[PDB]
From Swiss-Prot, chain B:
The chain holds residues 32 to 249 of 508 of the full protein. The keyword Metal-binding does not apply. This is Erythropoietin receptor. Glycans are attached at Q45. It comes from Homo sapiens (Human). The WSXWS motif appears to be necessary for proper protein folding and thereby efficient intracellular transport and cell-surface receptor binding. The box 1 motif is required for JAK interaction and/or activation. Changing M143A: Little effect on EPO binding. Belongs to the type I cytokine receptor family. Type 1 subfamily. Changing T83A: Little effect on EPO binding.
Curated annotation (Swiss-Prot), chain C:
This is Erythropoietin. It comes from Homo sapiens. It is found in: Secreted. It comes from the Eukaryota. Glycans are attached at K23, K37, K82. Disulfide bonds join C6-C153, C28-C32. Changing P86L: In ECYT5; uncertain significance. One of its GO terms (biological process) is embryo implantation. Produced by kidney or liver of adult mammals and by liver of fetal or neonatal mammals. Hormone involved in the regulation of erythrocyte proliferation and differentiation and the maintenance of a physiological level of circulating erythrocyte mass. Binds to EPOR leading to EPOR dimerization and JAK2 activation thereby activating specific downstream effectors, including STAT1 and STAT3. GO terms for molecular function: cytokine activity; erythropoietin receptor binding; hormone activity; protein kinase activator activity. It is linked to Microvascular complications of diabetes 2: Pathological conditions that develop in numerous tissues and organs as a consequence of diabetes mellitus. They include diabetic retinopathy, diabetic nephropathy leading to end-stage renal disease, and diabetic neuropathy. Diabetic retinopathy remains the major cause of new-onset blindness among diabetic adults. It is characterized by vascular permeability and increased tissue ischemia and angiogenesis. Erythrocytosis, familial, 5: An autosomal dominant disorder characterized by elevated serum hemoglobin and hematocrit. Some patients have increased serum erythropoietin levels.
Amino acid sequence: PDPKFESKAALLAARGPEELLCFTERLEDLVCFWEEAASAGVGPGQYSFSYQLEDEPWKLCRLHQAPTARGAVRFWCSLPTADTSSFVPLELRVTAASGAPRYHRVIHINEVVLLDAPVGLVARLADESGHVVLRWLPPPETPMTSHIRYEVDVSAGQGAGSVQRVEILEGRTECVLSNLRGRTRYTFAVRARMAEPSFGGFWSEWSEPVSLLTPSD
Amino acid sequence: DPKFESKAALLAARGPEELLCFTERLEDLVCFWEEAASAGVGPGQYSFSYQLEDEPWKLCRLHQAPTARGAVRFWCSLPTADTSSFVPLELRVTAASGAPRYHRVIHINEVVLLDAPVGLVARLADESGHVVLRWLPPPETPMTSHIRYEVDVSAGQGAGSVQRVEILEGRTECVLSNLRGRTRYTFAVRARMAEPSFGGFWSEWSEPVSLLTPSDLD
Amino acid sequence: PPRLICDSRVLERYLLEAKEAEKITTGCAEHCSLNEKITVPDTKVNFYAWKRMEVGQQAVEVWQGLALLSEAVLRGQALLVKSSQPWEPLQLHVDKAVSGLRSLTTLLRALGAQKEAISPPDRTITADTFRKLFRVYSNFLRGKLKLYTGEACR
């Protein structure tokens, strides 16, 4: 439907397509999908998706077929809000008309969190030394911001062939790269992932890059 | 009756012309208001009634008193029994004429105004601009864990000095940083109830404790 | 081996959701009526007794309370479904609650809120409106719940 989803669903397609890929953007939702190009056969009623939250009744999810760029068709199921309980075991059951079981998996909407990319990043010289202070804003409409860790990226060229990484402490949304190299124009961008054990999911889309040029030496 | 004047007087200033309520041990409520009055003023004027959501409206025995400012102050002290926190409490203050004087709805747990922490003690910490503050939560107080503090540091009025920093909930200690060498500072602390289960007003500063930095410089 | 409910933050999420549950039902007019009692638990705490209580003894007060509430929300979402004009805004919150309780009822079962329930030891309120259901909602959450988890989280 929305680019946000397609583009966010690509990151996962490269993580095991012939497996059910679910993920929650803000612990208040859940969607599972899987791709497969097919024959003129595959259509509306050809697959039945069913889920069940711990010791409760089973419920059938309406299904959503859609044609992806790579030609394949996409099937997805946005769980009904009333069933996005995090910390509660979710068992997923898929099936094709006849009665063949394609995928079966048990999860927790809280261990598959794929967060929107961070926002508000901007660099700026450390008035107290040849470093770079990096402030930024976690993802919007996203809870548990105190449970999100950030990985920063440091690039001196898409062809400079020389980079450097860093991991930020859950909660901290600012860091200064002290040990660096001057009179050089660097660029940075950050991604965000929830913090285990409590949570878990997948790295977030990198943020818009940002550029600056350290003083001298 | 004593320190009451203190807090009551504390609150007052902050918000003068309205109805003020607050709590201490959370096992008590006291509301009031101070109006200047010459040709008329006295208990045989107002009627004070309140009600705990889903409970019968009641009236409170209002009291009176003279103010250091020459005005009067009517207060009410809900009977200990009716100090139920976590349940809408509605208040209506009416004049004998029957005019709508004061009207408000609150949560006892949301108007706590603790005293002021005790035993503050900040001493040097060998390293550079680093100070170690230590203290104790307000006396006779419930749910320490839910109290969040706030320290103040100043270079004395000898440089138009200030600096404020908040602490984590329940944390009775703070280790400052980046303090000018050789200077007479003054560390103060404040108390308050953390949200969202509580909340209220900022406590009165505790007894200050000063100290002078050596010469950790070049 | 996580008794998750204890991580202050993990729980704070709900309390803050209910703050939104409320903050919306207030600006709500006639379209927040329940057209039925809906029995919710008693949310008022009297520290001079609670403080006097015992975890175990509180626990029950809470477990039972949570339950009853959970029955409500459902009953709310319910009466809200068959409704002609379901105030979309209201909808969402009514749901998050449904789930919130589900996740909570679990994290408590952890601590041992159930085991510390049907152990033979030694109220009625009713929301004729949503505006109140949510009010009564958070008040129990940050109220008795939040006050129990603490002492019990050791």
